[PDB]
Amino acid sequence: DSQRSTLVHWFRKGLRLHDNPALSHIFTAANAAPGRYFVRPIFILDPGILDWMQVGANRWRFLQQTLEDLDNQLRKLNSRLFVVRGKPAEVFPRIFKSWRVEMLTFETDIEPYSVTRDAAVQKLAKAEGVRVETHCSHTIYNPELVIAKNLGKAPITYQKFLGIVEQLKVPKVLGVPEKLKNMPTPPKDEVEQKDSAAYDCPTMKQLVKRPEELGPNKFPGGETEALRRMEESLKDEIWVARFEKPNTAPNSLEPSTTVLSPYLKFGCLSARLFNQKLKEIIKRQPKHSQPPVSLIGQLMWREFYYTVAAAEPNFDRMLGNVYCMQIPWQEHPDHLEAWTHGRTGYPFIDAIMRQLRQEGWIHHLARHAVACFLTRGDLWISWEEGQRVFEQLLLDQDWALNAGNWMWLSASAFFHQYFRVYSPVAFGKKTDPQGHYIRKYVPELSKYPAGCIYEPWKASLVDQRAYGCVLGTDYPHRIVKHEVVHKENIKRMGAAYKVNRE
Ligand SMILES: Cc1cc2nc3c(=O)[nH]c(=O)nc-3n(C[C@H](O)[C@H](O)[C@H](O)COP(=O)(O)OP(=O)(O)OC[C@H]3O[C@@H](n4cnc5c(N)ncnc54)[C@H](O)[C@@H]3O)c2cc1C
């Protein structure tokens, strides 16, 4: 009857209860002063973007599942999730007054949109007397401290980055907040009085406006599934200890790596928790792998890309990007849409592009293959176009990680040995000589013998008819001949590399 002010936590990333310092500070404070505070954990959902085509339906569904899981977990603590519809610029001045907000917390984000939006709300909060407290728990280290320790610039090599963060101190990992005590549900504000369900978690139908893009629900969203999935990947301590990234297959029928990337992108899983549990396993396993190929090395790859991205607001762009080589990519809408829909005539990369569309995840080396094909390998199209397609279809779509890896693959930054080119025919044969992966995702070739399913043009016309799929009618011809265009493109990279040094 005497709760006079509301404490608010604001989810954007960090969609978990565990290891969430911003959220547990609100819960601790509320329990330390029983009867003074109402608590409101909020997510702000702008309905204007549900139609944006850069967010595929698979990612929308992941988000719906994550928010439901989050609301369920918060109910066990005598709270709940409040999903507020609106744009933050209009929501915060209302609830600041209406809920009499005393404190606001959230996890920090380095993406340029977030940085400016957060600065706006900080300004408004200072004016309105609201104390703001932010925490850096999306990453293991704080990119500003690593850039500081490096005398003001981001390290541009992996090994150098490791040298700095070795000097850094590792944050302590928190558990879950404790059940709220002596706290009734908050009284209804002006909009809850008009509709008691106005802040309820949205249904699938409300979030997924194009249900026809949905594929099979292989990777459910949310913290509960995140933690369950981590535990099973660590149950086999020897597999964890001897993990070597380049030796995992891109084209096995079940994933050869952890597929924790979607959960780390949304914050359903704490990277700091994952890192600590991995440290404990390395400790008691005397022969283990080392960075960069080890599992801890993979998390360090995430950390590296986040800190260089923090220093450059054009990280997702060629021009204005201080890291990125200026390379004269060409435009070809026909080649681009063929790549985009997995109709290039190279069965291996077509199968990758179709797994991506249907399922929303593909293995790291599968990404290397289709990215190299689109850019410096064959089509000579800008990595920005590949970033665009990946952004639509990837569950783990991440601003820094997508752009950084595309600049790497296209030899625009961080990696410069452009003479190495992946072969669209040969690369996958090493790990799937029978072509099971191709048969699953390119089912029109599923009756081809293994001796030509990677290169169906080697089959005669009589054989093609026997296999049930003739090139040019049931499956396209190669849109380019790899063995000639890749030689040309190696020359153009040398030309562009001269112009940049000069
Ligand atoms: C063109 C291209 C685009 C990419 N875009 C993304 C993206 O949008 N989102 C994304 O999360 N990763 C991206 N990656 C990196 C990498 O391919 C994925 O992180 C990884 O395949 C996810 O599978 P996993 O969780 O099983 O990885 P694991 O091998 O199990 O590694 C564990 C975790 O380490 C991190 N990690 C692993 N490899 C990398 C890497 N190369 N760079 C950065 N972090 C890494 C991720 O958090 C990952 O979940 C991209 C790579 C390429 C070549």
Residue numbers in the entry: 2 to 503
The authors write:
To compensate for this, archaea, prokaryotes and eukaryotes have photolyase proteins, which repair damaged DNA using the energy of visible light. The photoreceptor protein uses near-UV and visible light (300–500 nm) as an energy source to monomerize (6–4)TT [or (6–4)CC] lesions in DNA.
The room-temperature structure was solved to 2.27 Å resolution and was obtained by serial femtosecond crystallography (SFX) using an X-ray free-electron laser. For SFX experiments, we developed a batch crystallization protocol in combination with a seeding method and successfully produced crystals with a homogeneous size distribution of 20–40 µm. Using only 975 µg of protein, we recorded 209 242 diffraction images with a total acquisition time of about 2 h. Indeed, the mean r.m.s.d. calculated on the main-chain residues is 0.35 Å, which indicates that the position of the main chains was unchanged. However, some of the positions of the side chains change at the higher temperature. The residues with high r.m.s.d. values for side chains are located either on surface regions or loop regions. The X-ray pulses at free-electron lasers are so short that diffraction is recorded before absorbed X-rays can do damage to the protein structure, and we therefore presume that our SFX structure is not subject to radiation damage. In our SFX structure the isoalloxazine atoms occupy the same plane, and butterfly bending along the N5–N10 plane was not observed. Despite their small size, our microcrystals diffracted beyond 2.27 Å, a resolution that is high enough to be able to observe conformational changes of side chains upon blue-light activation and is suitable for a time-resolved pump–probe serial crystallographic experiment.
